[PDB]
Amino acid sequence: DSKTVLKFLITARERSNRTFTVLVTEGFPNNTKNAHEFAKKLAQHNIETLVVPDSAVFALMSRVGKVIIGTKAVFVNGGTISSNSGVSSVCECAREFRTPVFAVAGLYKLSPLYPFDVEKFVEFGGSQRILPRMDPRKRLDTVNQITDYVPPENIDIYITNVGGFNPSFIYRIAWDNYKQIDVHL
Amino acid sequence: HPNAATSDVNVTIDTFVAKLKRRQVQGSYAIALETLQLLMRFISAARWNHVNDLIEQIRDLGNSLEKAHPTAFSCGNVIRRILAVLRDEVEEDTMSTTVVAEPLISSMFNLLQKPKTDYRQVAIQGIKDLIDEIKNIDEGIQQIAIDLIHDHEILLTPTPDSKTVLKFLITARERSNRTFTVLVTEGFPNNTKNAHEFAKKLAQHNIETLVVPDSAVFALMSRVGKVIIGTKAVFVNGGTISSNSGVSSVCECAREFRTPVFAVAGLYKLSPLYPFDVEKFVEFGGSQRILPRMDPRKRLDTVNQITDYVPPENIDIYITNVGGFNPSFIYRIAWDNYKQIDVHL
Amino acid sequence: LIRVGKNDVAVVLRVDKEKGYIDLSKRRVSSEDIIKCEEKYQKSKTVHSILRYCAEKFQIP
Amino acid sequence: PGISSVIPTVLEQSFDNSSLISVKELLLNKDLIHPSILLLTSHLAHYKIVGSIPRCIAMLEVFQIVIKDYQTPKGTTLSRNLTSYLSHQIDLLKKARPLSVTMGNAIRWLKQEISLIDPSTPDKAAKKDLCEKIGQFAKEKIELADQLIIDNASTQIEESTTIVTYGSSKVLTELLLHNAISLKKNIKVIVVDSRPLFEGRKMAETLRNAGVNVMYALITSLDTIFNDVDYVFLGAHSILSNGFLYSRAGTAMLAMSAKRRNIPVLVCCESLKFSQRVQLDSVTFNELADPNDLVNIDYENPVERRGNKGALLNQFIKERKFEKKKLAMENKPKGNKIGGKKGSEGESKDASNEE
Amino acid sequence: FNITETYLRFLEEDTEMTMPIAAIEALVTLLRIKTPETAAEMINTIKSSTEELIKSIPNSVSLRAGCDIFMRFVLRNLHLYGDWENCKQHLIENGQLFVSRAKKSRNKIAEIGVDFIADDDIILVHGYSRAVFSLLNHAANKFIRFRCVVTESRPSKQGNQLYTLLEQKGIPVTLIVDSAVGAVIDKVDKVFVGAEGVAESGGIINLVGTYSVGVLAHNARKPFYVVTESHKFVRMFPLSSDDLPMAGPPLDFTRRTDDLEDALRGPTIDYTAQEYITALITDLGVLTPSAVSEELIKMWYD
Amino acid sequence: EDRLQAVVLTDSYETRFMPLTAVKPRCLLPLANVPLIEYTLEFLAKAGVHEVFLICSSHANQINDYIENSKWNLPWSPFKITTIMSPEARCTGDVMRDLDNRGIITGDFILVSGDVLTNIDFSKMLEFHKKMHLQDKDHISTMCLSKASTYPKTRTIEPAAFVLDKSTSRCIYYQDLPLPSSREKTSIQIDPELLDNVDEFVIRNDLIDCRIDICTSHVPLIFQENFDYQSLRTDFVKGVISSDILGKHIYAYLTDEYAVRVESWQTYDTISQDFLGRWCYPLVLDSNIQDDQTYSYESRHIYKEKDVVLAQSCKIGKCTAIGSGTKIGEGTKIENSVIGRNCQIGENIRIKNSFIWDDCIIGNNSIIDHSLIASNATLGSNVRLNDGCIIGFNVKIDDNMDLDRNTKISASPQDLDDQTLAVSIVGDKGV
């Protein structure tokens, strides 16, 4: 969705001689419209676009070479909280099938705070755009989360304005701009 | 038990031994054929009268053959199959002589609970059956072969030494609309020339050939989709003896990458005795073939091996002339070809 | 760096005139003084060399 | 003036960006160019022994020699068309054989030196000092580091050894020699050879020159060996900012095998060979050579038989290519030996920003 | 005067003291007797004393590390280029102060860095460390709901001791067998560690059985953690999966000699690899990913 | 191509084995834990035999017994052993004469002197010989020579400097020199009789003796004619060069693969080592040749028969082989040494680079370095042997001895020091 990621993609496309294939997962809740917008923008310049269902990753991951994410929140041990919708399962799949992961990031977007528990940092989301009318909600229990956390076990490169960094090393980078004192107050 | 009873009945044992030792016989098929011929000779000549005694004699012969040579397996297997064939007929004969026979299915508890004669023709027929089985393996698998590999996918192929594997590959390649890329590893001190030949053949066959140095497997593994073992012999717990050199490492790599490992062989290559070890089975080549010199080469003790063993773990599926069997299933198949008492000689 | 052969300029800080414990310092020596030290060391070396070969030849300590 | 043209064998399909092709046989070049550099480049091109350590040293030596020989013009200063000359030389080098991380470092150092003494100085005063400085640098950052590494290695063995080895790298060989001689331990060395350029054979020769108990094997022949045997060693060329091992040929497979058989591997590193450049794949930038590296059959290198194969361009519909430099797995090798004795590969760029 | 004597002095109490902190204090005390102005009569002597201590060791690892830390501190101290007196005085001061700081660090660990067991995440802990127990007790104090899981320690019956120390708080616990470790990974969340030392390579210098545990954790993908008072980085490199500087023999192959004797020599010290530290609780702020290595680099300026 | 008889010179190179060969015939001695004759026989079979003939002499009864024992004896074999029995003690000319007298001589008959065992396939060689014959009437006999490790060093008895052809493969000069051992007669000659006819002169020395000859109808007749050729190498080739029978061709087969014949003791050891390793293409003991054999192959270049036991905790170098009926104790330091059939080991023994024959007790605290112990000869307590100590028949090495390097000990139940009776000479004992 973001103008950074989009710009990066445009830059990539400018040298069109390089053979790159664009697979876009819709992202169940809010990401769909954004995805569509992105596709439209791609079409404006003339870039090939393929639409991916979120359920189907296991049947595609063995074919996919490289993965790029445009995350919002970057963390200590190498993990990220990204701009919503189904990332964790995908990452797990990648880990299983062994797949390289890139990320467009910024050190100002990087946080010196450490995520220690899954029970807290994972943010649950609205069931407004899931099921119409609220009388079935009496007995059934709809479980839904919008924004998701990524474990550092998967991603390996963080392409920034400075350069690509290792996830089990990004702490040093963070500290080359932030401190240990300004955390707990 | 060596040759002593054989007079003006059978002489060709010595010839067989010679063929085994100094290698005038080449290719498993040829060995199998030889074995069949030997069996035929045995049948057309030897004196019968009793049945149990004949069986004992056959067992003794088998034992002798085993003593003579271990690295040949097809020969053994064929003999075992023939024995099994004989056995059923013998059982039938016994059942007639005695005169309940079958409850519902083939059942256990048979080892705990108590269970003029013609057979020569049946033995002959068994040999014919064996011959038929041998005839063609590829004409029985290539229908379940152009089924696994598809468009824009990439193969990784070690061991072009087995004649079946090459043929299978050719069959896979046949199509005009389908396109795929093939990686071929060498295996230097025992299989280089063969590999080169295979590459040449691939080139001839209008396919995108890729020459691989044995080191450069790792820098291309990200694109790898399939693994095929060029095996020559098959065993009890699914395991296989390969047609020599440069497979094991590749297999290990595949396992690490969790990248599909298929096995192509044949059920005549199937043996009813367990690989108790690898040391007794796998043999070493020639230490002279790697490095020249001799007089200061007493210090330079060099190690090179031909044959290769793969564990019952890295293997996944065995599509045969009959169909797709599995590593944890082949025992039943073995039983169906070679019977209970026939294993232990 | 700094292994075997390379010369290090030093000024004596603390001397134990009883058993033998010597303290030395490199940074206290000024840039002008280093050269002087080297010259003195060179001279000393020459003196030692002078009294080495000669000592050997006549066969006396 | 200079023209390329005429490329041998099929160009395949994949890996089509890197400079590897052309001027193998000499036929007309530029006029007032010093030929020693050219000779060196030629040597580098037709070399079968060199590996990581010595090339850069050789280059440095050549540069020193050039400086010693260098004539300051009768009218113009020390640097005017000198820079142009240097550029030309660099281009020639590139044409001959790719500039590695070490080469880049050397170039950087040269640039720094140039910056330090800029257009003001006469003939035999500036270069007199410069040469000496260079010598001092050579004495410092390299030889002493090597010595340190050797000493680290010396202590690294405690009680009993049975080792499997691979690599052209001089340091490893030196270590092995040390083990053989000035330590008098119960050392055992098993050698692994590689096809493209011969290293294993060289290692064996070196061992012989000492008189060691030596087993010998190759890339594929691995499984039967381990039937008691513990230690495993490797030698790397260069490590990037990423932390991944951007080294030569057959290492990774061996490492994997070692991991499987339950006793890990240790590789040796240098406190200079680190790059700003970022890569994680084979396609980006790789050492690539002419397919003549896989022609020879059996025993030795120079034999030549007219039996089965002996054509490349005539081999119609065929795509023959091979890789030299590999990108080995990060988590697999445990120990790394640099100037700070011992530490994990989690360092990555802990010397890059140190400058 | 002896550091050994000082070490002997503390035995039954402790629990509050932290490894090198006491050792460091002892060293400081030893120093502030025989004129700390000079450097020739001092540093060398200190080194000799440390060597002697090392020689005298029955079964203790972190002492060396402590000594090294002390040395580093001393080195840091004299760079001001003013006068010998002030620096000496400062050196003399910095021992009791260091000890005091340890307590502060412990407190910090116990109040800020305790958000790993909160949502009734069942903790798999083996190897008696004081820091771990402090964390436990202060979790109980905060009421931060929790359950405990401990594998039975039976080389010298420390398990019983551990159980007793857990009865003080008043919370139900269970016994676990270290062969039936594959049997239970079902309800227990993550594996946490109390150990002896932190490795140069990245792994952990720990007791009787750890590698298996690590393997199991890896299989289960339930992240492995280490809980320590963070200054036990011993100058030791475990280059292989089974090679270390050890207090005893490495898997002692015994001969059939007498009747029921040469077997009880259990390998009571073991190791697991560097690719296991998801997080390590350190008093210098929560920093782990390649932190120990960085620290080492900072120390040896390389 | 087909129907070829085998004639092998046996009972000839006795006393060349400097202590051995007096009581039992030369060939009957156990080579690599099992009789030498068998290997040779196998080789002959591989080559292409139709009837076996050996020129036995030294005590014929034992030879006859061996024949009776053997596998080629009864009907099943394509070739039977019936050895030629002649008057005692005679040279190769005399042997040839005897053969001629006997009568059974064919066209393309095979003559091998001594005992040889190598790998190279002989059919091709035979074909080549036939082709050569088909060229011209004047073609005689076949030579077997193989290339070695660049420089010569372990070669003093037969370092032949072969001046050879590439276009026709024909010898020009033959010379044996004592130059690597005793620098007295360093000499190389080029004869001018075939100088201005060949043009493609190649000077070589690095070739090894095999003494295997395929002989045409010319050879025995030639022998009969000329009584001066009592030998077969130094006189014969020279004679051929000189054109005694004017204008005749000889072949020189050159093979890249290794081929050596049996000659001395160090050479024997080397041969044994080669056999143990994988130096010749297929040659193995584990395949089993002689009836009662129960040999099996093992990893790390190790040979073990059945009824073979080695005990735990023996930290070792590389390559060890044991014969049947052997019991080995505990705690030994061994590097590259071989132990024979039914040899017993107590405890605590250091061994380095050795070969051991039939029934030799390796006693408590003993060192065997580059030295052989023969049949029934046994080592007792505290014996310190060194490099190249040669032991013969019934040498009962009992209590407390120290023998120096290259010491030779007498065999038969005389010319050389150290005798058959109790303790070898350090303190004088004997008759």
Tab-separated table of N, CA, C and O in Angstrom, chain B residues 258-311:
chain	number	residue	atom	x	y	z
B	258	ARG	N	14.412	-31.014	1.665
B	258	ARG	CA	13.088	-31.654	1.529
B	258	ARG	C	12.565	-31.612	0.083
B	258	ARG	O	11.422	-31.218	-0.180
B	259	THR	N	13.432	-32.025	-0.842
B	259	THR	CA	13.160	-31.999	-2.278
B	259	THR	C	12.975	-33.443	-2.786
B	259	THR	O	13.875	-34.270	-2.604
B	260	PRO	N	11.802	-33.746	-3.404
B	260	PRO	CA	11.347	-35.085	-3.824
B	260	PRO	C	12.416	-36.059	-4.335
B	260	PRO	O	13.189	-35.723	-5.237
B	261	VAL	N	12.438	-37.250	-3.735
B	261	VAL	CA	13.358	-38.327	-4.103
B	261	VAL	C	12.549	-39.543	-4.561
B	261	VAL	O	11.876	-40.195	-3.756
B	262	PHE	N	12.614	-39.820	-5.863
B	262	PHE	CA	11.975	-40.993	-6.468
B	262	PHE	C	12.982	-42.110	-6.730
B	262	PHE	O	14.171	-41.846	-6.937
B	263	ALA	N	12.497	-43.351	-6.725
B	263	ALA	CA	13.335	-44.518	-6.995
B	263	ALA	C	12.789	-45.349	-8.151
B	263	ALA	O	11.631	-45.783	-8.130
B	264	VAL	N	13.636	-45.547	-9.162
B	264	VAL	CA	13.301	-46.319	-10.364
B	264	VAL	C	14.253	-47.518	-10.452
B	264	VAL	O	15.477	-47.341	-10.472
B	265	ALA	N	13.685	-48.727	-10.494
B	265	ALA	CA	14.466	-49.972	-10.558
B	265	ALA	C	13.755	-51.121	-11.289
B	265	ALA	O	13.921	-51.288	-12.501
B	266	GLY	N	12.967	-51.898	-10.542
B	266	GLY	CA	12.344	-53.130	-11.031
B	266	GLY	C	12.314	-54.198	-9.951
B	266	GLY	O	13.220	-54.269	-9.115
B	267	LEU	N	11.274	-55.031	-9.975
B	267	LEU	CA	11.068	-56.052	-8.934
B	267	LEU	C	11.787	-57.396	-9.165
B	267	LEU	O	11.624	-58.335	-8.375
B	268	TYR	N	12.577	-57.486	-10.238
B	268	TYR	CA	13.516	-58.602	-10.415
B	268	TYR	C	14.811	-58.297	-9.660
B	268	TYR	O	15.555	-59.207	-9.283
B	269	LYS	N	15.053	-57.003	-9.452
B	269	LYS	CA	16.176	-56.494	-8.666
B	269	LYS	C	15.894	-56.607	-7.159
B	269	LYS	O	16.778	-56.363	-6.330
B	270	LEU	N	14.660	-56.987	-6.825
B	270	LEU	CA	14.190	-57.157	-5.452
B	270	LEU	C	14.745	-58.428	-4.805
B	270	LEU	O	14.566	-59.528	-5.332
B	271	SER	N	15.405	-58.259	-3.657
B	271	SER	CA	16.053	-59.358	-2.930
B	271	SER	C	15.320	-59.717	-1.629
B	271	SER	O	14.868	-58.816	-0.915
B	272	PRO	N	15.207	-61.030	-1.314
B	272	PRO	CA	14.517	-61.451	-0.089
B	272	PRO	C	15.406	-61.580	1.160
B	272	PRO	O	14.953	-62.116	2.181
B	273	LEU	N	16.645	-61.087	1.078
B	273	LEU	CA	17.544	-61.058	2.234
B	273	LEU	C	17.940	-59.631	2.606
B	273	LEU	O	18.233	-58.806	1.735
B	274	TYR	N	17.934	-59.368	3.912
B	274	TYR	CA	18.180	-58.045	4.492
B	274	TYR	C	19.621	-57.568	4.286
B	274	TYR	O	20.546	-58.386	4.308
B	275	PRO	N	19.817	-56.246	4.073
B	275	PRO	CA	21.181	-55.726	4.131
B	275	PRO	C	21.597	-55.513	5.587
B	275	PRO	O	21.434	-54.417	6.140
B	276	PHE	N	22.106	-56.588	6.194
B	276	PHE	CA	22.567	-56.599	7.588
B	276	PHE	C	23.627	-55.527	7.844
B	276	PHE	O	23.672	-54.934	8.926
B	277	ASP	N	24.473	-55.298	6.839
B	277	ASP	CA	25.446	-54.209	6.830
B	277	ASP	C	25.511	-53.540	5.451
B	277	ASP	O	24.622	-53.727	4.611
B	278	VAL	N	26.556	-52.739	5.247
B	278	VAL	CA	26.886	-52.128	3.958
B	278	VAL	C	28.267	-52.644	3.536
B	278	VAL	O	28.535	-52.835	2.345
B	279	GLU	N	29.111	-52.895	4.540
B	279	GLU	CA	30.509	-53.317	4.378
B	279	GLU	C	30.668	-54.611	3.564
B	279	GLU	O	31.534	-54.688	2.687
B	280	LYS	N	29.828	-55.608	3.856
B	280	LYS	CA	29.832	-56.900	3.151
B	280	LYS	C	29.296	-56.804	1.720
B	280	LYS	O	29.659	-57.613	0.861
B	281	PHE	N	28.442	-55.809	1.482
B	281	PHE	CA	27.737	-55.646	0.211
B	281	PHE	C	28.480	-54.735	-0.765
B	281	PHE	O	28.797	-55.147	-1.884
B	282	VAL	N	28.751	-53.504	-0.332
B	282	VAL	CA	29.423	-52.490	-1.149
B	282	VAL	C	30.922	-52.798	-1.261
B	282	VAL	O	31.592	-53.035	-0.249
B	283	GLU	N	31.424	-52.804	-2.496
B	283	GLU	CA	32.840	-53.055	-2.786
B	283	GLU	C	33.563	-51.784	-3.258
B	283	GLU	O	32.927	-50.828	-3.717
B	284	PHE	N	34.891	-51.792	-3.133
B	284	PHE	CA	35.751	-50.679	-3.541
B	284	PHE	C	36.374	-50.932	-4.913
B	284	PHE	O	36.609	-52.083	-5.293
B	285	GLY	N	36.639	-49.850	-5.645
B	285	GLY	CA	37.158	-49.920	-7.015
B	285	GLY	C	38.651	-50.150	-7.100
B	285	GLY	O	39.164	-51.151	-6.593
B	286	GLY	N	39.341	-49.217	-7.755
B	286	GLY	CA	40.788	-49.273	-7.928
B	286	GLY	C	41.458	-47.994	-7.470
B	286	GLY	O	41.180	-46.918	-8.006
B	287	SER	N	42.341	-48.126	-6.482
B	287	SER	CA	43.098	-47.005	-5.915
B	287	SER	C	44.098	-46.391	-6.904
B	287	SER	O	44.497	-45.232	-6.753
B	288	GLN	N	44.485	-47.177	-7.909
B	288	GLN	CA	45.394	-46.750	-8.976
B	288	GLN	C	44.744	-45.753	-9.944
B	288	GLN	O	45.442	-44.948	-10.568
B	289	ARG	N	43.414	-45.803	-10.046
B	289	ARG	CA	42.649	-45.003	-11.011
B	289	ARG	C	42.575	-43.501	-10.684
B	289	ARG	O	42.254	-42.689	-11.558
B	290	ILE	N	42.880	-43.141	-9.437
B	290	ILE	CA	42.829	-41.743	-8.987
B	290	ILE	C	44.165	-41.031	-9.213
B	290	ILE	O	44.199	-39.939	-9.790
B	291	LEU	N	45.249	-41.661	-8.759
B	291	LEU	CA	46.581	-41.056	-8.754
B	291	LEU	C	47.629	-42.014	-9.345
B	291	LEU	O	47.639	-43.201	-8.998
B	292	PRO	N	48.510	-41.505	-10.243
B	292	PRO	CA	49.611	-42.310	-10.802
B	292	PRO	C	50.725	-42.605	-9.782
B	292	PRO	O	50.528	-42.392	-8.583
B	293	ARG	N	51.869	-43.097	-10.268
B	293	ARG	CA	53.039	-43.479	-9.447
B	293	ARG	C	52.812	-44.737	-8.594
B	293	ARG	O	51.668	-45.124	-8.338
B	294	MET	N	53.908	-45.376	-8.175
B	294	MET	CA	53.842	-46.653	-7.447
B	294	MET	C	54.861	-46.813	-6.315
B	294	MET	O	54.483	-47.139	-5.186
B	295	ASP	N	56.138	-46.583	-6.623
B	295	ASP	CA	57.239	-46.784	-5.666
B	295	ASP	C	57.247	-45.814	-4.463
B	295	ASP	O	57.510	-46.258	-3.340
B	296	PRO	N	56.974	-44.499	-4.683
B	296	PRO	CA	56.731	-43.647	-3.510
B	296	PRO	C	55.250	-43.585	-3.100
B	296	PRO	O	54.908	-42.889	-2.136
B	297	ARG	N	54.397	-44.316	-3.821
B	297	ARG	CA	52.947	-44.346	-3.579
B	297	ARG	C	52.490	-45.357	-2.511
B	297	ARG	O	51.284	-45.508	-2.276
B	298	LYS	N	53.450	-46.031	-1.871
B	298	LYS	CA	53.190	-46.889	-0.701
B	298	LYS	C	52.687	-46.044	0.475
B	298	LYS	O	51.838	-46.488	1.255
B	299	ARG	N	53.232	-44.829	0.581
B	299	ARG	CA	52.826	-43.817	1.561
B	299	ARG	C	51.429	-43.274	1.240
B	299	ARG	O	50.605	-43.093	2.142
B	300	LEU	N	51.180	-43.024	-0.048
B	300	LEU	CA	49.920	-42.455	-0.535
B	300	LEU	C	48.830	-43.521	-0.690
B	300	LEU	O	48.485	-43.918	-1.811
B	301	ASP	N	48.301	-43.985	0.441
B	301	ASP	CA	47.177	-44.922	0.449
B	301	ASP	C	45.880	-44.169	0.142
B	301	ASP	O	45.380	-43.395	0.969
B	302	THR	N	45.362	-44.393	-1.066
B	302	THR	CA	44.212	-43.654	-1.598
B	302	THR	C	42.931	-44.488	-1.546
B	302	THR	O	42.960	-45.697	-1.795
B	303	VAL	N	41.814	-43.829	-1.228
B	303	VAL	CA	40.520	-44.505	-1.044
B	303	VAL	C	39.520	-44.118	-2.141
B	303	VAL	O	39.248	-42.933	-2.360
B	304	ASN	N	38.996	-45.137	-2.825
B	304	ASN	CA	37.919	-44.984	-3.809
B	304	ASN	C	36.988	-46.194	-3.821
B	304	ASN	O	37.442	-47.341	-3.802
B	305	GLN	N	35.689	-45.910	-3.875
B	305	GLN	CA	34.632	-46.924	-3.855
B	305	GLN	C	33.719	-46.827	-5.075
B	305	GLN	O	33.447	-45.727	-5.568
B	306	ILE	N	33.262	-47.982	-5.559
B	306	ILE	CA	32.316	-48.035	-6.676
B	306	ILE	C	30.894	-47.884	-6.132
B	306	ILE	O	30.370	-46.772	-6.087
B	307	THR	N	30.305	-48.999	-5.688
B	307	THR	CA	28.897	-49.086	-5.263
B	307	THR	C	28.513	-48.159	-4.106
B	307	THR	O	29.364	-47.750	-3.313
B	308	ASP	N	27.222	-47.835	-4.035
B	308	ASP	CA	26.683	-46.885	-3.063
B	308	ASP	C	25.431	-47.437	-2.382
B	308	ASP	O	24.593	-48.077	-3.029
B	309	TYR	N	25.318	-47.180	-1.079
B	309	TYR	CA	24.130	-47.538	-0.301
B	309	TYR	C	23.377	-46.288	0.147
B	309	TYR	O	23.986	-45.280	0.521
B	310	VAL	N	22.049	-46.374	0.098
B	310	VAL	CA	21.150	-45.317	0.572
B	310	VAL	C	20.237	-45.907	1.667
B	310	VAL	O	19.646	-46.973	1.460
B	311	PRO	N	20.138	-45.226	2.838
B	311	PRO	CA	19.297	-45.662	3.969
B	311	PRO	C	17.790	-45.740	3.654
B	311	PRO	O	17.334	-45.069	2.722
